[PDB]
Amino acid sequence: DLYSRYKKLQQELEFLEVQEEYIKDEQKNLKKEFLHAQEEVKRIQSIPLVIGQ
Amino acid sequence: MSEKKQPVDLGLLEEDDEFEEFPAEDWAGLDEDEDAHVWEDNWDDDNVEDDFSNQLRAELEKHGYKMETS
Amino acid sequence: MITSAAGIISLLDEDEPQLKEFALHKLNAVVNDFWAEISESVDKIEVLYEDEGFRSRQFAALVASKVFYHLGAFEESLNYALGAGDLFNVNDNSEYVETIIAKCIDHYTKQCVENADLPEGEKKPIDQRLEGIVNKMFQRCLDDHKYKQAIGIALETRRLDVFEKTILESNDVPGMLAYSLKLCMSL
Amino acid sequence: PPGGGEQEPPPPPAPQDVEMKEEAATGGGSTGEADGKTAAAAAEHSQRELDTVTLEDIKEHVKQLEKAVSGKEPRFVLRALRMLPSTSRRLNHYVLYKAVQGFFTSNNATRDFLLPFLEEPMDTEADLQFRPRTGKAASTPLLPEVEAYLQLLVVIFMMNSKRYKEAQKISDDLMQKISTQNRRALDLVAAKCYYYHARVYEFLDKLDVVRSFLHARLRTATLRHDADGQATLLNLLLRNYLHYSLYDQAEKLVSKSVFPEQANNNEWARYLYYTGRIKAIQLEYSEARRTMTNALRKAPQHTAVGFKQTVHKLLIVVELLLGEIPDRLQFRQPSLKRSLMPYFLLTQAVRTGNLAKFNQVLDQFGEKFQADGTYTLIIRLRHNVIKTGVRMISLSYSRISLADIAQKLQLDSPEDAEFIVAKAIRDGVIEASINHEKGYVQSKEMIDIYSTREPQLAFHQRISFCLDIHNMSVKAMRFPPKSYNKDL
């Protein structure tokens, strides 16, 4: 189990390594979706309107 | 670590063991007039003061005598 | 003994190598003290290493290999280390030997992995002395096997007949095979 | 006598409380932290350790305590000794053994019981489990206290401490590699110890063994190291090569490496001071100047008053060699002033450039800078006066008089004038146009900057470099917030 710990840990290494491109995709895409929704709720606001008090 | 400052401090103690409070007061003679004054401007001031310390310290009164001769 | 002495450089740049021999022998004593002094003699060492003029290739190969991982990458050191030809070295606790055999084993199993997916064709040449110096320490650790790393290194080397001699003498064979499969399924 | 006798007991055990609290908080805190995971936490308590060291360096603790206050020396940690489980009885013993000496009196000594400190490590340091880290955290803090006052025949005892330290750990090691935080601390700790007995080394004998084997001990560290400990061990070697080396053919440009990330807010300053001192011998105008000046502008943390004074002296000394010497302006302290007082007159006399008088003037009151030894940079400076002077001439007008300026420079002759001028031209540090018509030598001597002349190629490298610095500064405002958000 001592020498097996290495070979067993390699799987965890690859598993933790594969998450890099994943979080890259998330952080790059969700900000684009963020500005998307931002402009979506921004275009809701229009100049012509009624003035209250 | 900073432990290397000890022999330097001891060296300073030796420098203080050389003379006792002589340069302190001797330079305090100037520093008392130099006190409260910006030490940035004192560089050029001490520069010119030490430059003219040898000869032509004033020279402003000599100009009138140098009018006819030059 | 000597440290900043540049004399051994002039001796290494000098002909009639019979006087260069003991100079290099004494150089091997101070090489651990200062590896920076040999840096200027590295090129000449390489020069005398290339030609067959000198009788002992291992004497130059050892100095080159030990000064290379001190200076540059472990690769260039391993080249002359594995290209040292016939070499006799007893087991030692020194850093040099264990590190160079560490890189030797790592690069060996690296080449084994690289050649694992290529069963036939374009086979890379493998020297016999490499297999010898690897299997020497391998068997040395395979004496009692210590019931741990035997099947591990047997699997990591990606060799077909390597694990057949490992199961010759062992305790609790079904447990060893179970542990083996357990190790093989997790990789 | 009766007054001082009645007032005698309160002063000596002043630090005891806060010191016990200190070692309890640091030890119990660190151990109680990394106990669950040692390999996880890395160098969290390191800065605290070095801070406590730098704080305890100025300690006024032992003065009149030389008499029977040494009873704290025989006693020690004693945390959960001889058995791993059943620590309750020992939790009682923690109060008990402290209560024993608190009844009436206690038998104390100084030089009597010293050597047998290795009794416990022979079997169990503390818990038989955590022994290396608990052991170092036990022995190492109290050792400088016992080894304090290097003078008065403590040299032999210091040697005993040496061989004991080695034999227990330093000789080689307790195991192949610790590979943990206690190891990462062990680097700077053992290094600090090396700096501690360095004084004993350089005191009388020389080095035939230890630091020479420290190379093998350095490469024993793997190249996968952050090279922090490697650099700290490199500092003592470089300092050992500081006084006398004189061979630049190897370690210069061989010792250069990948140079990994290291800060510590100390090592940068002191190592830049070291390599600056080494590179000050060839008189580097470009790199050494700005990097040593920057190094002077760095390390605000502890003391710039008593430390940076030396590198400031060296700074102005290598500054006056260019003909333009800046003085002390922004920094106000009553140290560098007194240190520069004898040197002030001459460093101010540099710009004047009078050979004859100042030749005698220097040697007249000269003490310290000629006590630097072997008259090197000063025997260079003496004839550097005329080079800085002719450089001032290069900054001066073009037309050269055979009488006026020849008398002003105290040198009158047709040949050597134009000759030395040409020698100032071949340097490439200035700009001049050599022309001969009526026998007089003129110059264009344009000092005008790059403004409105090839601007792009001019400030190109400046823009690139500054943008690189600002971008790595963006990285510097990037990674640490992630280091903040890692645990939350």
For residues D191-218, one letter each, b for 16 or more C-beta atoms within 10 angstroms of the residue's C-beta and e for the rest, the string is bbbbbbbbebbeeeeeeeeebbebbebe
* CA neighbours closer than 13 Å in the CB half-sphere of residue D187: 23
Q: Does D219 touch chain C (CB under 8 A)?
A: yes
Residues from chain D that touch B5, judged by Cβ atoms under 8 A, are 57, 303, 306-307
As a residue count, chain A comes to 53
Spatial contact of D247 and C4, defined as CB atoms under 8 Å apart: yes
Picking from C153, C155, C186, the nearest residue to A8 by CB comes out as C186
Give D437-477 as a DSSP string: SSS-B--------STTSSHHHHHHHHHHHHHHHHHHHHHHT
Whether residue D251 and residue C36 make contact (CB cut-off 8 A), yes or no, is yes
How far is D81 from D99, CA to CA, in rounded Å? Answer: 18
How far is D343 from D348, CA to CA, in rounded Å? Answer: 8
As a residue count, chain D comes to 488
How far is C4 from D250, CA to CA, in rounded Å? Answer: 9
Helix (H, G, I), strand (E, B) or coil at C120: coil
Residues from chain B that touch D307, judged by Cβ atoms under 8 A, are 2, 5, 8
Q: Which residue has the tokens 């035939």?
A: D208
Residues from chain A that touch C147, judged by Cβ atoms under 8 A, are none
Q: Does D425 touch chain B (CB under 8 A)?
A: no
How far is B59 from B48, CA to CA, in rounded Å? Answer: 13
Whether residue A4 and residue C183 make contact (CB cut-off 8 A), yes or no, is yes
Measured at the CA of D229, the angle between CA D480 and CA D131, to 5 degrees, comes to 100
How many other C-beta atoms lie within 10 A of the C-beta of residue C5? 13
How far is D358 from B54, CA to CA, in rounded Å? Answer: 13
Whether residue D215 and residue C71 make contact (CB cut-off 8 A), yes or no, is no
* D433 closest CA partner among D424, D423, D442: D442
Q: Does A3 touch chain C (CB under 8 A)?
A: yes
Whether residue C186 and residue A3 make contact (CB cut-off 8 A), yes or no, is no
* D219 closest CA partner among C74, C10, B1: C74
Resolution (A): 6.8
Q: Does A8 touch chain C (CB under 8 A)?
A: yes
Spatial contact of D211 and D240, defined as CB atoms under 8 Å apart: yes
* D193 closest CA partner among D172, D162, D216: D162
How far is D19 from A7, CA to CA, in rounded Å? Answer: 48
Picking from A4, A10, A11, the nearest residue to C152 by CB comes out as A4
Q: Does A7 touch chain C (CB under 8 A)?
A: yes
> In angstroms, what separates the C-alpha of B2 from chain D's closest C-alpha?
6
Q: Does C110 touch chain A (CB under 8 A)?
A: no
**Residue D415 φ then ψ, to 5°:** -70, -55
Residues from chain D that touch B40, judged by Cβ atoms under 8 A, are 329-330
| Angle formed by the axes of helices D336-349 and D308-319, nearest 10° | 0
> In angstroms, what separates the C-alpha of D433 from chain B's closest C-alpha?
32
Tell me C165's DSSP state.
T
Q: Which residue has the tokens 């490499």?
A: C130
Within 8 A by CB and 6+ apart from D411, the residues are D386, D417
Spatial contact of D238 and D277, defined as CB atoms under 8 Å apart: no
Spatial contact of D425 and D370, defined as CB atoms under 8 Å apart: no
Tell me D436's DSSP state.
B
Spatial contact of B2 and D266, defined as CB atoms under 8 Å apart: yes
Measured at the CA of D433, the angle between CA D427 and CA D437, to 5 degrees, comes to 130
Whether residue A3 and residue C187 make contact (CB cut-off 8 A), yes or no, is no
Alpha helix positions (H), D83-130:
88-100
> Per CB distance under 8 Å, which residues of C are interface residues toward D?
3-4, 6, 32-37, 39-40, 70-71, 95
Q: Which sign, positive or negative, has the C-alpha torsion C25, C30, C32, C35?
A: negative
| Number of H-type helices and E-type strands within chain C | 9, 0
Within 8 A by CB and 6+ apart from C69, the residues are C77, C99, C100, C103
Spatial contact of D199 and D240, defined as CB atoms under 8 Å apart: no
D256: left (phi over 0), alpha (psi -120 to 50) or beta: beta
Give D132-196 as a DSSP string: HHHHHHHHHHHHHHHS-S-TTT-HHHHHHHHHHHIIIIITS-SSS---SHHHHHHHHHHHHHHHH
How far is C146 from A32, CA to CA, in rounded Å? Answer: 57
What was the elucidation method? cryo-EM
How far is D112 from D205, CA to CA, in rounded Å? Answer: 27
Q: Which residue has the tokens 């036939």?
A: C120
How far is B58 from D393, CA to CA, in rounded Å? Answer: 25
Residues from chain B that touch D306, judged by Cβ atoms under 8 A, are 5, 8-9, 12
CA dist list (Å): C139 to C95, C135, C157, C163, D284: 21, 6, 13, 11, 58
Residues from chain D that touch C70, judged by Cβ atoms under 8 A, are 219
> In angstroms, what separates the C-alpha of A9 from chain C's closest C-alpha?
9
How many Å from the N-terminal Cα to the C-terminal Cα in chain D?
63
How far is C119 from C117, CA to CA, in rounded Å? Answer: 6
Within 8 A by CB and 6+ apart from D132, the residues are D125, D174, D175, D178, D182
Element (H, E) at C156: helix C150-156
Spatial contact of C35 and C6, defined as CB atoms under 8 Å apart: no
Q: Does D176 touch chain C (CB under 8 A)?
A: no
| Token pair in block for residue D392 | 């001032």
